């Protein structure tokens, strides 16, 4: 599923990302935009053998288990397949655990390169929430 900007903003708010551990809602919508372009089925094979999964491109070397990644740690205790659903529940649960580490949202390269330091609030402006 490909979410509309405002559609995802409302969904993420319902899933409790509107100000979660210091991160405003705009950060999460902006992250999804540049990580997966709002596509829940997005996958990206990496050079180290890992793969990034879903709307928030969660990695299989550190966060989820896809059974094909060397050195997998499965920090989110969840199969990567659960992160490739139109239902963002699992991705949000894992994203919350990821951001509960001192590294915060820096775990998301796209967010770091295209969102951090920008007017992230603009990503939820003009939306019925």
């Amino acid at each position, epitope marked *: 599923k490909v979410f509309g900007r405002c559609e995802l903003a409302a969904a993420m*708010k*319902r*899933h*409790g*990302l*509107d*100000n*979660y*551990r210091g991160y405003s809602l705009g950060n999460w919508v902006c992250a999804a935009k540049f990580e997966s372009n709002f596509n829940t089925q997005a996958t990206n094979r990496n050079t180290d053998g890992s793969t990034d999964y879903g709307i928030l491109q969660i990695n299989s070397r*550190w966060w989820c288990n896809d059974g094909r990644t060397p050195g997998s*740690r*499965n*920090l989110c*205790n969840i199969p990567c397949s659960a992160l490739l659903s139109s239902d963002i*529940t699992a991705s949000v*649960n894992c994203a*919350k*655990k990821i951001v*509960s*580490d*001192g*590294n915060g949202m820096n775990a998301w390269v796209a967010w770091r390169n295209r969102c951090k330091g920008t007017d992230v609030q603009a990503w939820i402006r003009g939306c019925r929430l």
Partner: antibody
Amino acid sequence: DVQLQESGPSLVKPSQTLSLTCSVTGDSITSDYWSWIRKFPGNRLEYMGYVSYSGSTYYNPSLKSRISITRDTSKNQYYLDLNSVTTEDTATYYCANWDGDYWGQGTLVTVSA
Amino acid sequence: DIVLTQSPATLSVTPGNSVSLSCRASQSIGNDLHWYQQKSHESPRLLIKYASQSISGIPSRFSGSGSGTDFTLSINSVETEDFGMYFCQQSNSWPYTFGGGTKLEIK
């Protein structure tokens, strides 16, 4: 499957350092975030803190910098050190993973002169 | 810090009847409210996470609801094994905090 178990002194003196160990079996300590929670004699629960994968720690401000949570991957254990304890620190201490699915059996620690 | 207030402090019920337990946060915590059960001489057991998400291995009779500041844990047809303490816990902001607990007893 995963198993957690607390170990350490059950009786300590005021002003000393209370130290507990949580042994993890079934999976690596590098595969989760680890926490310490305690229950005071009056049924009050307090989340003491946790250590995440990067090594970053989060401690409850109520502990006024008296707490330290560390890890030892080689022994697959993590620890709780609480300095300058008082009678107010008498409680049942539990270790559990951040998700809350795995908990130790809990161990009572009494602080008395 | 976020203060969680649970009510009632104690609830008596006869097995077979249903009950609902309340937990209110001093400020909005979205859906970051979890429910735990705790019996004498035992570690807490996670029943519901993120307000209403089910947990594998927990009886189906347990359900959670709510968002923002008002949450509820419902038990459809209480069983004797359900008697004990129930605590809510928020993880929206650090430090994580627990409610004062609600004791469920046989009536």
